[PDB]
Each structure stands twice: as C-alpha cells, then as structure tokens.
C-alpha cells in the first residue's frame, strides 16, 4: 500500500530513452548487477552506475534521460514508486528539519545516492521475502533518514512542500484527466494568474499541450500496471482523443510502442 514495485528486464547493451516523462509519484530505481550509463539530458551529466547506485526522481518533475546497459548479460532494473500516503506519513519525521531544509535549493530533479551494504539490502527487500515485514516505524525512519542525507548531499529539496504550484496544477489535472484542459481553466481553478503559473512549465521545458499529454501518459502507465491490457480502452480512459494519438505520444515519451511496454510488464 506504501510501495508499488516493478522489475524490468534490460537486454545486453540495450538503451531506454525517456522524453518528457512526468513523474506522478516519487520514484527510486537501481540495477541489480553489472554497470549502466545514465545520461541526464536536462542537466547534461552522465553517470556510470552499479548495483548500489540509487537514482531518485522527484514527484512532478519532467524527465529527459537515457539508461544504457554496459553488461553482456541481462540486467534487472528495480523501480520503487512511493505512495503519497507514505510520503505524508513522513511529515513529522522531517518537520523538525524545517530550518535546515529552508536553506536548500529546489532545482535538482534526479539525484544519485551511492549505497552502503545495509541500505541496499533494505531497498531490495521492499522490492522482494521477510516472514515479518518491516514495521511502519522502521520504514518511516529509514526513508526519512535516506531522503534527508540525499537532500544534504545536494543541498536540495527532494520532498517538495505541499503548497508547491506545480503540485497544484498536476493535482488538478489528475482530478479530471479527460477534461479538455486549457490554460484558462488552470488559472480559473487555482485563482492564480498566468504570469505566476507559467514558470512551472517554463522551468520544466514544456508547453501546455506537452504537459497535459505527459500527465496522461503516466496515467496510462498506471492503468497498465494494474493489469489493463485493452489498448483502445487505455487510450480513452487516459484522456487521449484517439488510439493513434495515444500511441504517437507514448512512442515519443517511452521510445517503445504501448504494446511493447505491456510486454515488459506482463510478458
Ligand atoms: C520503455 C522502458 C520501460 C521502463 C524501464 C525503466 C528503467 C529505468 C527508469 C526507471 C524510472 C522510470 C520508470 C517509468 C515506468 C514506471 O513508472 O515504472
Ligand atoms: Cl484535451
Ligand atoms: Cl472564487
Ligand atoms: Cl504554455
């Protein structure tokens, strides 16, 4: 209920490429073996990562990056998606750090942490096997402390404040994903003018249509993760005008066809 997990198979020397990928919830991912090369197109940095490198992706960010396998065997990429309800339960564990965190910047959307033995073991277990599950207290302490040391390393906010304008925009769109959203609706619903709100899109490198489409793709991904497989139904449930429009945007965003992503999940 707190963590949704996926393990993707990555073939030798394959490359996954994401363009305008909207991060609907906080995510963490890492490879289980070998080496990979992560290229972050938004900041123009590359990382060689190994099985202890954790990549954290901030909620409401718009990602542009590739991941290239450098191993001659299959690599498994584990992905934890953290529920909003679990994040909210961390509020008391970092509130005391308000003075500390108000000094941090808010720009970085993709963060790396090189793990010690104990930390990668816990994260693997979340994705896996224990007869007695970690307690709620253990998990809240582990993840608040983990995010805290990542934030300190970068002097940067990872867990964004509840009042952020991008969260207001995204939450509104996600409340009625098929609505024929236009900028005026956002300004009207948030009672905030365009001069203020537009920086949320500008700083993320998207125009309005690209933003709405990106949120709709991540909705379709969520539907597929629940076991929906009827491509036409998925396209319409997610607010696309047609299957062809859905497929075109999905291909641009994920660099694979919807049918191929379904196979990565269920095949
Ligand atoms: C077409 C690629 C399929 C997904 C492979 C994911 C591998 C590395 C990136 C992990 C973070 C982005 C995951 C997006 C899909 C998801 O939400 O599970
Ligand atoms: Cl629309
Ligand atoms: Cl009003
Ligand atoms: Cl715009």
Residue numbers in the entry: 5 to 132, 134 to 272
Question: Could you give the paper's own sentences about this structure?
Answer:
ToxT directly activates the expression of the genes encoding the toxin-coregulated pilus (TCP), which is essential for colonization of the human intestine, and the cholera toxin (CT), the cause of the diarrheal disease that is characteristic of cholera. In V. cholerae, ToxT-dependent gene activation is inhibited by both bile and individual unsaturated fatty acids found in bile. Although oleic acid is likely to be the physiological effector of ToxT given its high concentration in bile, both PAM and oleic acid have been shown to reduce the expression of tcp and ctx in vivo and to reduce DNA binding by ToxT in vitro.
Tyr108–Asp113 form a connecting loop between α1′ and β9. Interestingly, the ToxT region between α1 and β9 (residues Asp101–Glu110) is folded over a loop that is located sequentially after it: the loop that connects helices α3 and α4, spanning residues Lys158–Ala170. Our structure suggests the possibility that Arg105 holds Glu156 in a position that somewhat attenuates ToxT activity. In addition, three chloride ions were modeled in the C-terminal region of ToxT, which were assigned based on the coordination distances (∼3.1–3.3 Å) to neighboring residues and water molecules. Overall, the new structure provides more complete, detailed and higher quality structural information for ToxT than the previously determined ToxT structure.
